[PDB]
């Protein structure tokens, strides 16, 4: 069943900021993943890379919050 | 990952589970029993007539108390 | 020859045909077994059957268990 997978869910969901801060992220990006802050953009964007995924998923962006 | 499919199937199987439990709940509440006396056979129907005529509600079955209390002799 | 020829061409029909021959044989076995017990003084009778004592049907009623 949950072979150290529900644990990983707990990491992303909780440290997101709670039910609200996991749902809004999910609601906006249609997926929730774990990476490291590669660098903060000049325009509020935030870049995340994680070699755990593959090339399509390797690197990704969370756009500026004010873009609803 | 494959939980992706579960939301759908979980929803569909839920919706198709509803009606029976709707039928059960509405029966056991709003009749007195969860099952409506099936009337496929002649004998079931006549017994249904017999019940429906003894009292307006067949499902309001009359126990053995309906027997006359006593015969003096 | 014809044997493998059909069993190579029309396998479902060959398999189906063997099924049909199986059924009829056991069907004849069914009829035979049925009339071993005479099959007509059946144990359980539809409706409410009653006989006056000594009626030839009454003389015939099975006294067995089931």
């Amino acid at each position: 069943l949950g072979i150290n997978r529900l644990t990983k869910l707990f990491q992303m969901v909780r440290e997101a900021g709670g039910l609200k801060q996991a749902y809004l992220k999910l609601y906006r990006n249609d997926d929730l993943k774990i990476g490291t802050l590669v660098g903060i953009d000049k325009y509020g964007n935030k870049y995340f890379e994680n070699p755990y995924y593959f090339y399509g998923r390797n690197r990704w962006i969370e756009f500026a919050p004010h873009v609803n | 990952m494959w939980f992706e499919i579960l939301p759908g199937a979980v929803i569909i199987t839920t919706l198709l589970s509803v009606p029976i439990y709707a039928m059960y709940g509405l029966d056991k509440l709003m009749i007195g029993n969860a099952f409506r006396r099936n009337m496929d056979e002649r004998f079931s129907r006549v017994m249904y007539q017999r019940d429906f005529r003894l009292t307006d509600n067949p499902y309001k079955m009359n126990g053995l108390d309906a027997i006359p209390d006593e015969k003096t002799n | 020859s014809l044997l493998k020829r059909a069993w190579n061409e029309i396998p479902d029909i060959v398999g189906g045909s063997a099924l049909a021959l199986a059924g009829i044989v056991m069907a004849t076995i069914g009829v035979a077994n049925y009339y071993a017990k005479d099959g007509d003084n059946r144990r359980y009778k539809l409706g409410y059957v009653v006989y006056r004592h000594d009626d030839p049907r009454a003389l015939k009623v099975r006294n067995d268990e089931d």
């Binding site: - | 056979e41 002649r42 004998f43 006549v46 | 539809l46 409706g47 409410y48």
Partner: protein, 167 residues
């Protein structure tokens, strides 16, 4: 009430049937007629067994030929007339109110549905089709079924003899 309303619907559709001339419109009219007649015979029967039967043979399969070969279409579609519909609605309604007026019972058939048989009848407490269809198979009135099936076999020999005119 259902019985005489069903007469009324059959009457109205019958008037529709004799007017319509477009083959689809006629074939459509038969379709409705068949449902109605199945309903009606069912009511006066012991059960709806025969109604389901003739439904799937007459309507379900055999009216497919009629519509299909009458797919000539006239080369053009219907010019539906809301007037015969309105008359159909009009004739239906006062027939329907008369149906509300007509004598409740005497205007009904007298046939004996399974319910309208007496309680004592020990035969009526069997499977509804058991005793009716008994002698379609039990001797000596079952060979006629054999004649039916061979008749149908011969019917196919005939169809391939008529439907095989050089093509």
């Amino acid at each position: 009430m259902i019985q005489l309303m069903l007469y009324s619907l059959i009457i109205t559709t019958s008037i529709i049937f004799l007017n319509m001339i477009h083959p689809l419109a006629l074939g459509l009219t038969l379709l409705i007629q068949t449902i109605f007649v199945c309903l009606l015979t069912g009511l006066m029967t012991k059960s709806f067994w025969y109604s389901y039967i003739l439904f799937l043979i007459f309507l379900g399969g055999m009216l497919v030929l009629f519509i299909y070969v009458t797919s000539l279409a006239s080369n053009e579609m219907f010019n539906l007339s809301m007037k015969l519909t309105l008359f159909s609605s009009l004739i239906l309604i006062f027939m329907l109110i008369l149906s509300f007026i007509m004598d409740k019972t005497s205007s009904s058939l007298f046939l004996m549905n399974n319910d309208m048989q007496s309680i004592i009848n020990m035969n009526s407490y069997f499977m509804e089709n058991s005793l009716s269809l008994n002698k379609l198979y039990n001797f000596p009135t079952n060979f006629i079924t054999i004649l039916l099936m061979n008749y149908l076999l011969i019917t196919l020999i005939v169809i391939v003899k008529i439907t095989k005119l050089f093509k």
